[PDB]
Amino acid sequence: SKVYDSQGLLIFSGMDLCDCLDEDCLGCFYACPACGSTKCGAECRCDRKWLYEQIEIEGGEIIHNKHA
Amino acid sequence: LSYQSHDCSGACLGENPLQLPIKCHFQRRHAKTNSHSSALHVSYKTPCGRSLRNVEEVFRYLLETECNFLFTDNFSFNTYVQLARNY
Ligand SMILES: [Zn+2]
Ligand SMILES: [Zn+2]
Ligand SMILES: [Zn+2]
């Protein structure tokens, strides 16, 4: 089932979260080609059926999704 | 590499050419989905905290930052390439 609504807000909480997984990020991407948002990663958040559980920095820290 | 909302410019900005961006304070990031069968997406984070999705956006970033010394093959979006190991 969907994790985000048609605008790329989380269904569970309604929050508008950057795919870089810093909960406080303003949106660090260029405009998403599909919806315009600076918060969408490789795949648009709108109606997406998954979220990122973690991000591994090559040579560095693992970042965990603070919400999941 | 926190991001503050900005328009990029020049002020934003080796044995192994794959390590050159990392020496210039880029990060290479591997994002793991929560799908039952997991997918990985590679992105780069720039020195000014911009996230880049693909080589077209790397090109845009190097144009905006007037960077003449990084090229297409200094970057890889392949989830199985390790920058330390695949050179
Ligand atoms: Zn972000
Ligand atoms: Zn989008
Ligand atoms: Zn910048």
Coordinates of all heavy atoms in Angstrom, one line a residue, chain B, unseen atoms left out:
Chain B
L1 N 26.8 16.9 6.3 CA 26.8 17.9 5.3 C 25.4 18.5 5.2 O 24.6 18.3 4.2 CB 27.2 17.2 3.9 CG 28.7 17.0 3.7 CD1 29.0 16.2 2.5 CD2 29.5 18.3 3.6
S2 N 25.0 19.2 6.3 CA 23.7 19.9 6.4 C 23.6 20.9 5.2 O 24.6 21.3 4.6 CB 23.7 20.7 7.7 OG 22.6 21.6 7.7
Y3 N 22.3 21.1 4.8 CA 22.0 22.0 3.7 C 21.3 23.3 4.2 O 20.4 23.1 5.0 CB 21.1 21.3 2.7 CG 20.6 22.2 1.5 CD1 21.5 22.5 0.4 CD2 19.3 22.7 1.5 CE1 21.0 23.2 -0.6 CE2 18.9 23.5 0.5 CZ 19.7 23.8 -0.6 OH 19.2 24.5 -1.6
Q4 N 21.7 24.5 3.8 CA 21.0 25.7 4.0 C 20.5 26.1 2.6 O 21.3 26.0 1.6 CB 21.9 26.8 4.6 CG 21.3 28.1 4.9 CD 20.4 28.1 6.1 OE1 20.8 28.2 7.3 NE2 19.1 28.0 5.9
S5 N 19.3 26.6 2.5 CA 18.6 26.9 1.2 C 19.4 28.0 0.5 O 19.6 29.1 1.1 CB 17.2 27.3 1.4 OG 16.4 27.2 0.2
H6 N 19.9 27.7 -0.7 CA 20.8 28.7 -1.5 C 20.7 28.3 -3.0 O 20.4 27.2 -3.4 CB 22.2 28.7 -1.0 CG 23.0 27.5 -1.2 ND1 22.9 26.4 -0.4 CD2 24.0 27.2 -2.1 CE1 23.7 25.5 -0.8 NE2 24.4 26.0 -1.9
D7 N 21.1 29.3 -3.9 CA 21.5 29.0 -5.3 C 23.0 28.8 -5.4 O 23.8 29.5 -4.8 CB 21.1 30.3 -6.2 CG 19.6 30.4 -6.5 OD1 18.8 29.5 -6.1 OD2 19.3 31.5 -7.0
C8 N 23.4 27.7 -6.0 CA 24.8 27.3 -6.0 C 25.6 28.3 -6.9 O 25.0 28.8 -7.8 CB 25.0 25.9 -6.5 SG 24.5 24.7 -5.2
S9 N 26.9 28.5 -6.5 CA 27.9 29.4 -7.3 C 29.3 28.8 -7.1 O 29.4 27.8 -6.3 CB 27.8 30.8 -6.7 OG 28.4 30.9 -5.5
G10 N 30.3 29.5 -7.6 CA 31.7 29.1 -7.3 C 32.1 29.0 -5.9 O 32.9 28.2 -5.5
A11 N 31.4 29.8 -5.0 CA 31.8 29.8 -3.6 C 31.4 28.4 -2.9 O 32.0 28.1 -1.8 CB 31.1 30.9 -2.9
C12 N 30.5 27.7 -3.5 CA 30.1 26.3 -2.9 C 31.3 25.4 -2.9 O 31.4 24.5 -2.1 CB 28.9 25.8 -3.7 SG 27.4 26.7 -3.6
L13 N 32.3 25.6 -3.8 CA 33.4 24.6 -4.2 C 34.7 25.3 -4.3 O 35.3 25.5 -3.2 CB 33.0 24.1 -5.6 CG 33.6 22.7 -5.9 CD1 32.9 21.6 -5.0 CD2 33.5 22.4 -7.3
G14 N 46.0 12.3 -7.1 CA 45.2 11.2 -6.8 C 45.4 10.0 -7.7 O 45.2 10.1 -8.9
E15 N 45.7 8.8 -7.1 CA 45.9 7.5 -7.7 C 44.5 7.0 -8.3 O 44.5 6.4 -9.3 CB 46.4 6.5 -6.6 CG 46.3 5.0 -7.0 CD 46.3 4.1 -5.9 OE1 45.5 4.3 -4.9 OE2 47.0 3.1 -5.9
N16 N 43.4 7.4 -7.6 CA 42.1 6.9 -7.9 C 41.2 8.0 -8.3 O 40.8 8.9 -7.4 CB 41.5 6.1 -6.7 CG 40.2 5.4 -7.0 OD1 39.7 5.5 -8.1 ND2 39.6 4.8 -5.9
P17 N 40.8 8.2 -9.6 CA 39.9 9.3 -10.0 C 38.5 9.2 -9.3 O 37.9 10.2 -9.1 CB 39.9 9.2 -11.5 CG 41.1 8.4 -11.8 CD 41.3 7.4 -10.7
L18 N 38.0 8.0 -8.9 CA 36.7 7.8 -8.2 C 36.8 8.4 -6.8 O 35.7 8.8 -6.3 CB 36.5 6.3 -8.2 CG 36.2 5.6 -9.5 CD1 36.0 4.1 -9.4 CD2 35.0 6.3 -10.2
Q19 N 37.9 8.6 -6.2 CA 38.1 9.2 -4.9 C 38.2 10.7 -5.0 O 38.0 11.4 -3.9 CB 39.3 8.6 -4.1 CG 39.0 7.2 -3.7 CD 38.3 7.0 -2.4 OE1 37.5 7.8 -2.1 NE2 38.6 5.9 -1.7
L20 N 38.4 11.3 -6.2 CA 38.7 12.8 -6.3 C 37.5 13.6 -5.7 O 37.8 14.5 -4.9 CB 39.0 13.2 -7.7 CG 39.6 14.6 -7.8 CD1 40.7 14.9 -6.8 CD2 40.0 14.9 -9.2
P21 N 36.2 13.4 -6.0 CA 35.2 14.2 -5.4 C 35.2 14.0 -3.9 O 34.9 15.0 -3.2 CB 33.9 13.5 -6.0 CG 34.3 12.9 -7.3 CD 35.7 12.4 -7.0
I22 N 35.5 12.9 -3.3 CA 35.5 12.6 -1.9 C 36.6 13.5 -1.2 O 36.4 14.0 -0.1 CB 35.7 11.1 -1.5 CG1 34.7 10.2 -2.3 CG2 35.5 10.9 0.0 CD1 33.3 10.7 -2.3
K23 N 37.8 13.6 -1.9 CA 38.9 14.5 -1.5 C 38.4 16.0 -1.5 O 38.8 16.8 -0.7 CB 40.1 14.3 -2.4 CG 40.8 13.0 -2.2 CD 42.1 12.8 -3.0 CE 42.6 11.4 -3.0 NZ 44.0 11.3 -3.6
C24 N 37.5 16.3 -2.5 CA 36.9 17.7 -2.6 C 35.7 17.8 -1.7 O 35.0 18.9 -1.9 CB 36.6 18.0 -4.1 SG 38.0 17.9 -5.2
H25 N 35.5 16.9 -0.7 CA 34.4 17.1 0.3 C 33.0 16.8 -0.2 O 32.1 17.1 0.5 CB 34.5 18.5 1.0 CG 35.8 18.8 1.6 ND1 36.3 18.1 2.7 CD2 36.7 19.7 1.3 CE1 37.5 18.5 3.0 NE2 37.8 19.6 2.2
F26 N 32.9 16.1 -1.3 CA 31.6 15.4 -1.6 C 31.5 14.1 -0.8 O 32.5 13.6 -0.3 CB 31.6 15.0 -3.1 CG 31.5 16.1 -4.2 CD1 32.5 16.9 -4.5 CD2 30.3 16.2 -4.9 CE1 32.4 17.8 -5.5 CE2 30.2 17.2 -5.9 CZ 31.3 18.0 -6.2
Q27 N 30.3 13.6 -0.6 CA 30.1 12.3 0.0 C 29.3 11.4 -1.0 O 28.4 11.9 -1.7 CB 29.1 12.3 1.2 CG 29.7 12.6 2.5 CD 28.6 12.8 3.5 OE1 27.4 12.9 3.3 NE2 29.1 12.9 4.8
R28 N 29.6 10.1 -1.0 CA 28.9 9.1 -1.8 C 28.0 8.3 -0.9 O 28.5 7.7 0.1 CB 29.8 8.3 -2.7 CG 29.1 7.3 -3.6 CD 30.1 6.8 -4.6 NE 29.6 6.0 -5.7 CZ 29.5 4.7 -5.8 NH1 30.0 4.0 -4.8 NH2 28.9 4.1 -6.8
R29 N 26.7 8.3 -1.1 CA 25.7 7.8 -0.2 C 24.9 6.7 -0.8 O 24.7 6.7 -2.0 CB 24.7 9.0 0.2 CG 25.4 9.9 1.2 CD 24.5 11.1 1.2 NE 24.6 11.7 2.6 CZ 23.6 12.0 3.3 NH1 22.3 11.8 3.0 NH2 23.8 12.6 4.5
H30 N 24.7 5.6 0.0 CA 23.9 4.5 -0.5 C 22.6 4.3 0.3 O 22.7 4.0 1.5 CB 24.8 3.2 -0.3 CG 26.1 3.3 -1.0 ND1 26.3 2.5 -2.2 CD2 27.2 4.0 -0.8 CE1 27.6 2.8 -2.6 NE2 28.1 3.6 -1.7
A31 N 21.5 4.6 -0.3 CA 20.2 4.7 0.3 C 19.5 3.3 0.2 O 19.3 2.8 -1.0 CB 19.3 5.8 -0.3
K32 N 19.0 2.7 1.3 CA 18.4 1.4 1.4 C 16.9 1.5 1.6 O 16.6 2.1 2.7 CB 19.1 0.5 2.4 CG 18.6 -0.9 2.5 CD 19.1 -1.8 3.7 CE 18.2 -3.0 4.1 NZ 18.5 -4.2 3.3
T33 N 16.1 1.1 0.7 CA 14.6 1.1 0.8 C 14.1 0.1 1.8 O 15.0 -0.7 2.2 CB 13.9 0.8 -0.6 OG1 14.2 -0.6 -0.8 CG2 14.3 1.7 -1.7
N34 N 12.9 0.2 2.2 CA 12.3 -0.7 3.2 C 11.4 -1.7 2.5 O 10.7 -2.4 3.3 CB 11.4 0.1 4.3 CG 10.1 0.6 3.7 OD1 10.0 1.0 2.6 ND2 9.1 0.5 4.5
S35 N 11.4 -1.8 1.2 CA 10.7 -2.8 0.4 C 11.2 -4.2 0.9 O 12.4 -4.3 1.3 CB 11.0 -2.6 -1.1 OG 10.3 -1.5 -1.6
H36 N 10.3 -5.2 0.9 CA 10.6 -6.6 1.4 C 11.9 -7.1 0.7 O 12.8 -7.5 1.5 CB 9.4 -7.5 1.3 CG 8.4 -7.4 2.5 ND1 7.5 -6.4 2.6 CD2 8.3 -8.2 3.5 CE1 6.8 -6.6 3.7 NE2 7.3 -7.7 4.3
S37 N 11.9 -7.0 -0.6 CA 13.2 -7.0 -1.4 C 13.8 -5.6 -1.6 O 13.2 -4.8 -2.4 CB 12.9 -7.7 -2.7 OG 12.0 -6.9 -3.5
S38 N 14.8 -5.4 -0.8 CA 15.5 -4.0 -0.7 C 16.1 -3.6 -2.1 O 16.7 -4.4 -2.7 CB 16.5 -4.0 0.4 OG 16.9 -2.7 0.8
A39 N 15.9 -2.3 -2.4 CA 16.7 -1.6 -3.5 C 17.7 -0.6 -2.9 O 17.4 -0.1 -1.8 CB 15.8 -0.8 -4.5
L40 N 18.8 -0.4 -3.6 CA 19.8 0.6 -3.2 C 19.8 1.7 -4.3 O 19.6 1.4 -5.5 CB 21.2 -0.1 -3.1 CG 21.4 -0.8 -1.7 CD1 22.5 -1.9 -1.9 CD2 21.7 0.2 -0.7
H41 N 19.9 2.9 -3.9 CA 20.1 4.1 -4.8 C 21.3 4.8 -4.3 O 21.4 5.1 -3.1 CB 18.9 5.0 -4.8 CG 17.6 4.3 -5.1 ND1 16.3 4.8 -4.7 CD2 17.3 3.2 -5.8 CE1 15.4 4.0 -5.1 NE2 16.0 3.0 -5.8
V42 N 22.3 5.1 -5.2 CA 23.5 5.9 -4.9 C 23.0 7.4 -5.2 O 22.4 7.7 -6.2 CB 24.6 5.5 -5.8 CG1 25.8 6.4 -5.6 CG2 25.0 4.0 -5.5
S43 N 23.5 8.3 -4.3 CA 23.4 9.7 -4.5 C 24.8 10.3 -4.1 O 25.5 9.5 -3.4 CB 22.3 10.3 -3.8 OG 22.5 10.3 -2.4
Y44 N 25.1 11.5 -4.6 CA 26.2 12.2 -4.0 C 25.7 13.4 -3.2 O 24.6 14.0 -3.6 CB 27.2 12.7 -5.1 CG 28.1 11.7 -5.6 CD1 27.6 10.7 -6.5 CD2 29.4 11.6 -5.2 CE1 28.5 9.8 -7.1 CE2 30.3 10.6 -5.7 CZ 29.8 9.7 -6.7 OH 30.6 8.7 -7.2
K45 N 26.3 13.8 -2.1 CA 26.1 15.1 -1.4 C 27.3 15.9 -1.7 O 28.5 15.4 -1.7 CB 25.8 14.8 0.1 CG 24.8 15.8 0.6 CD 24.2 15.4 1.9 CE 22.7 15.6 1.9 NZ 22.4 17.1 2.1
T46 N 27.1 17.2 -2.1 CA 28.1 18.1 -2.5 C 28.7 18.8 -1.2 O 28.2 18.6 -0.1 CB 27.5 19.2 -3.4 OG1 26.8 20.0 -2.6 CG2 26.8 18.6 -4.6
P47 N 29.8 19.5 -1.4 CA 30.4 20.3 -0.2 C 29.4 21.2 0.4 O 29.5 21.4 1.6 CB 31.6 21.0 -0.8 CG 32.0 20.1 -2.0 CD 30.6 19.7 -2.6
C48 N 28.5 21.8 -0.3 CA 27.4 22.8 0.2 C 26.1 22.0 0.5 O 25.1 22.7 0.8 CB 27.2 23.8 -0.9 SG 26.4 23.3 -2.4
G49 N 26.1 20.7 0.5 CA 25.0 20.0 1.1 C 23.9 19.7 0.1 O 22.9 19.1 0.4
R50 N 24.1 20.0 -1.2 CA 23.1 19.6 -2.3 C 23.2 18.1 -2.5 O 24.3 17.5 -2.5 CB 23.5 20.5 -3.5 CG 22.8 20.0 -4.8 CD 21.7 20.9 -5.3 NE 21.9 22.3 -5.1 CZ 21.0 23.1 -4.5 NH1 19.9 22.6 -4.0 NH2 21.3 24.4 -4.3
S51 N 22.0 17.5 -2.7 CA 22.0 16.1 -3.0 C 21.9 15.9 -4.5 O 21.0 16.7 -5.1 CB 20.9 15.3 -2.3 OG 21.2 15.1 -0.9
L52 N 22.6 15.1 -5.1 CA 22.6 14.8 -6.6 C 22.1 13.4 -6.9 O 22.7 12.4 -6.4 CB 24.0 15.1 -7.2 CG 24.6 16.4 -6.8 CD1 26.0 16.5 -7.3 CD2 23.8 17.6 -7.4
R53 N 21.1 13.3 -7.8 CA 20.4 12.0 -8.1 C 21.1 11.2 -9.2 O 20.9 10.0 -9.2 CB 19.0 12.3 -8.6 CG 18.1 13.0 -7.5 CD 16.8 13.2 -8.1 NE 15.9 14.0 -7.3 CZ 15.5 15.2 -7.5 NH1 16.0 15.9 -8.4 NH2 14.6 15.8 -6.6
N54 N 21.8 11.8 -10.1 CA 22.3 11.2 -11.3 C 23.4 12.1 -12.0 O 23.7 13.2 -11.5 CB 21.1 11.0 -12.3 CG 20.3 12.2 -12.6 OD1 20.9 13.2 -12.8 ND2 19.0 12.2 -12.6
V55 N 24.0 11.6 -13.1 CA 25.1 12.3 -13.7 C 24.7 13.6 -14.4 O 25.5 14.5 -14.4 CB 25.8 11.4 -14.8 CG1 26.4 10.2 -14.2 CG2 24.8 11.1 -15.9
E56 N 23.4 13.7 -14.9 CA 22.8 15.0 -15.4 C 22.8 16.0 -14.3 O 23.2 17.2 -14.6 CB 21.5 14.7 -16.0 CG 21.2 13.4 -16.7 CD 22.2 13.0 -17.8 OE1 22.8 13.9 -18.4 OE2 22.4 11.7 -18.0
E57 N 22.5 15.7 -13.1 CA 22.5 16.7 -12.0 C 23.9 17.0 -11.5 O 24.1 18.1 -11.1 CB 21.6 16.2 -10.8 CG 20.1 16.2 -11.3 CD 19.2 15.7 -10.1 OE1 19.7 15.5 -9.0 OE2 18.0 15.7 -10.4
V58 N 24.8 16.0 -11.6 CA 26.2 16.3 -11.3 C 26.7 17.4 -12.3 O 27.3 18.4 -11.9 CB 27.1 15.1 -11.5 CG1 28.6 15.5 -11.5 CG2 26.8 14.1 -10.4
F59 N 26.4 17.2 -13.6 CA 26.7 18.2 -14.7 C 26.2 19.6 -14.3 O 26.9 20.5 -14.2 CB 26.3 17.7 -16.0 CG 26.8 18.5 -17.2 CD1 28.0 19.2 -17.1 CD2 26.0 18.7 -18.3 CE1 28.5 20.0 -18.1 CE2 26.4 19.6 -19.3 CZ 27.7 20.2 -19.2
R60 N 24.9 19.6 -14.0 CA 24.2 20.9 -13.6 C 25.0 21.6 -12.4 O 25.3 22.8 -12.5 CB 22.8 20.7 -13.2 CG 22.2 21.9 -12.6 CD 20.7 21.8 -12.4 NE 20.2 23.0 -11.7 CZ 19.0 23.2 -11.2 NH1 18.0 22.3 -11.4 NH2 18.7 24.3 -10.6
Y61 N 25.4 20.8 -11.4 CA 26.1 21.3 -10.2 C 27.5 21.8 -10.6 O 27.9 22.9 -10.0 CB 26.2 20.2 -9.1 CG 26.9 20.7 -7.9 CD1 26.2 21.6 -7.0 CD2 28.2 20.3 -7.6 CE1 26.9 22.1 -5.9 CE2 28.8 20.8 -6.4 CZ 28.2 21.7 -5.6 OH 28.8 22.2 -4.4
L62 N 28.2 21.1 -11.4 CA 29.5 21.5 -11.8 C 29.4 22.8 -12.7 O 30.4 23.6 -12.6 CB 30.3 20.4 -12.5 CG 30.5 19.2 -11.7 CD1 31.3 18.1 -12.4 CD2 31.2 19.6 -10.4
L63 N 28.4 23.0 -13.5 CA 28.1 24.2 -14.3 C 27.8 25.4 -13.3 O 28.4 26.4 -13.5 CB 26.9 24.0 -15.2 CG 27.2 23.1 -16.4 CD1 25.9 22.7 -17.1 CD2 28.1 23.8 -17.4
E64 N 27.0 25.2 -12.3 CA 26.6 26.2 -11.4 C 27.8 26.7 -10.6 O 27.8 27.8 -10.2 CB 25.4 25.7 -10.5 CG 24.2 25.6 -11.3 CD 23.0 25.2 -10.5 OE1 23.1 24.8 -9.3 OE2 21.9 25.3 -11.0
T65 N 28.7 25.7 -10.2 CA 29.8 26.0 -9.3 C 31.1 26.3 -10.1 O 32.1 26.5 -9.4 CB 30.0 24.8 -8.3 OG1 30.4 23.6 -9.0 CG2 28.8 24.6 -7.4
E66 N 31.0 26.4 -11.4 CA 32.2 26.7 -12.3 C 33.4 25.8 -12.1 O 34.5 26.3 -12.1 CB 32.6 28.2 -12.1 CG 31.4 29.1 -12.0 CD 30.8 29.7 -13.3 OE1 31.4 29.3 -14.4 OE2 29.8 30.4 -13.3
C67 N 33.1 24.5 -11.9 CA 34.2 23.6 -11.6 C 34.7 23.0 -12.9 O 33.8 22.3 -13.5 CB 33.6 22.6 -10.6 SG 34.8 21.2 -10.3
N68 N 35.9 23.1 -13.2 CA 36.6 22.8 -14.5 C 37.4 21.5 -14.3 O 37.9 21.0 -15.3 CB 37.5 23.9 -15.0 CG 38.4 24.6 -14.0 OD1 38.7 24.0 -13.0 ND2 38.7 25.8 -14.3
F69 N 37.5 20.9 -13.0 CA 38.5 19.9 -12.7 C 37.8 18.6 -12.2 O 38.5 17.7 -11.7 CB 39.4 20.4 -11.6 CG 38.8 20.9 -10.4 CD1 38.6 20.1 -9.3 CD2 38.4 22.2 -10.2 CE1 38.0 20.5 -8.1 CE2 37.9 22.7 -9.1 CZ 37.6 21.9 -8.0
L70 N 36.5 18.4 -12.3 CA 35.8 17.1 -12.1 C 35.0 16.8 -13.4 O 34.5 17.8 -14.0 CB 34.9 17.2 -10.9 CG 35.6 17.3 -9.5 CD1 34.6 17.5 -8.4 CD2 36.5 16.1 -9.3
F71 N 35.0 15.6 -13.8 CA 34.5 15.1 -15.1 C 33.5 14.0 -14.9 O 33.4 13.5 -13.7 CB 35.7 14.7 -16.0 CG 36.8 15.7 -16.0 CD1 37.9 15.6 -15.1 CD2 36.7 16.9 -16.7 CE1 38.9 16.6 -15.1 CE2 37.7 17.9 -16.6 CZ 38.8 17.7 -15.8
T72 N 32.8 13.6 -15.9 CA 31.8 12.5 -15.8 C 32.3 11.3 -15.1 O 31.6 10.7 -14.2 CB 31.2 12.2 -17.2 OG1 30.0 11.5 -16.9 CG2 32.2 11.5 -18.2
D73 N 33.5 10.8 -15.4 CA 33.9 9.5 -14.9 C 34.6 9.6 -13.5 O 34.8 8.6 -12.9 CB 34.8 8.7 -15.8 CG 33.9 8.2 -17.0 OD1 32.7 7.9 -16.8 OD2 34.4 8.3 -18.1
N74 N 34.7 10.8 -12.9 CA 34.9 11.0 -11.5 C 33.7 10.5 -10.6 O 34.0 10.4 -9.4 CB 35.4 12.4 -11.1 CG 36.7 12.8 -11.7 OD1 36.8 13.6 -12.6 ND2 37.8 12.2 -11.2
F75 N 32.6 10.3 -11.2 CA 31.3 9.9 -10.5 C 30.8 8.5 -10.9 O 30.9 8.3 -12.2 CB 30.2 10.9 -10.6 CG 30.7 12.3 -10.2 CD1 31.5 13.1 -11.0 CD2 30.3 12.8 -8.9 CE1 31.9 14.4 -10.5 CE2 30.8 14.0 -8.4 CZ 31.6 14.8 -9.2
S76 N 30.3 7.8 -10.0 CA 29.6 6.5 -10.3 C 28.3 6.4 -9.5 O 28.4 6.5 -8.3 CB 30.4 5.3 -10.1 OG 29.7 4.1 -10.3
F77 N 27.2 6.0 -10.2 CA 25.9 5.8 -9.6 C 25.6 4.3 -9.5 O 24.4 3.9 -9.1 CB 24.8 6.6 -10.3 CG 25.0 8.1 -10.0 CD1 25.8 8.9 -10.7 CD2 24.3 8.7 -8.9 CE1 25.9 10.3 -10.4 CE2 24.4 10.0 -8.6 CZ 25.2 10.8 -9.3
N78 N 26.6 3.4 -9.6 CA 26.5 2.0 -9.5 C 26.6 1.5 -8.1 O 27.7 1.7 -7.5 CB 27.5 1.3 -10.5 CG 27.3 -0.2 -10.6 OD1 27.2 -0.8 -9.5 ND2 27.3 -0.7 -11.8
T79 N 25.6 0.9 -7.6 CA 25.4 0.4 -6.2 C 26.4 -0.7 -5.8 O 26.6 -0.9 -4.7 CB 23.9 -0.2 -6.0 OG1 23.6 -1.2 -6.9 CG2 22.9 0.9 -6.1
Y80 N 27.1 -1.3 -6.8 CA 28.1 -2.4 -6.6 C 29.5 -1.8 -6.7 O 30.5 -2.5 -6.4 CB 27.8 -3.5 -7.5 CG 26.5 -4.2 -7.2 CD1 25.6 -4.4 -8.3 CD2 26.1 -4.6 -5.9 CE1 24.3 -5.0 -8.0 CE2 24.9 -5.2 -5.7 CZ 24.0 -5.4 -6.7 OH 22.8 -6.0 -6.5
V81 N 29.7 -0.6 -7.2 CA 31.1 0.0 -7.3 C 31.4 0.5 -5.8 O 30.5 1.2 -5.2 CB 31.1 1.1 -8.3 CG1 32.4 1.9 -8.2 CG2 31.0 0.5 -9.7
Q82 N 32.5 0.1 -5.3 CA 33.1 0.7 -4.1 C 34.3 1.5 -4.5 O 35.1 1.0 -5.3 CB 33.4 -0.4 -3.0 CG 32.1 -1.0 -2.4 CD 31.4 0.0 -1.4 OE1 32.0 0.8 -0.8 NE2 30.1 -0.2 -1.4
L83 N 34.3 2.8 -4.2 CA 35.3 3.8 -4.7 C 36.7 3.3 -4.3 O 37.6 3.5 -5.1 CB 35.0 5.1 -4.1 CG 33.6 5.8 -4.4 CD1 33.6 7.2 -3.9 CD2 33.4 5.8 -6.0
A84 N 36.8 2.7 -3.1 CA 38.1 2.3 -2.5 C 38.7 1.0 -3.2 O 39.9 0.8 -3.0 CB 38.0 2.1 -1.0
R85 N 37.8 0.3 -3.9 CA 38.0 -1.2 -4.2 C 38.0 -1.5 -5.7 O 38.7 -2.4 -6.1 CB 37.0 -2.0 -3.4 CG 37.2 -1.9 -1.9 CD 36.4 -2.9 -1.1 NE 37.0 -3.2 0.2 CZ 36.3 -3.6 1.3 NH1 35.0 -3.7 1.3 NH2 37.0 -3.8 2.4
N86 N 37.2 -0.8 -6.4 CA 37.0 -0.9 -7.9 C 37.7 0.1 -8.7 O 37.1 0.8 -9.5 CB 35.5 -0.9 -8.3 CG 34.7 -2.1 -7.7 OD1 34.0 -1.9 -6.8 ND2 35.1 -3.3 -8.1
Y87 N 39.0 0.2 -8.4 CA 40.0 1.0 -9.3 C 41.3 0.2 -9.3 O 41.9 -0.1 -10.3 CB 40.2 2.4 -8.8

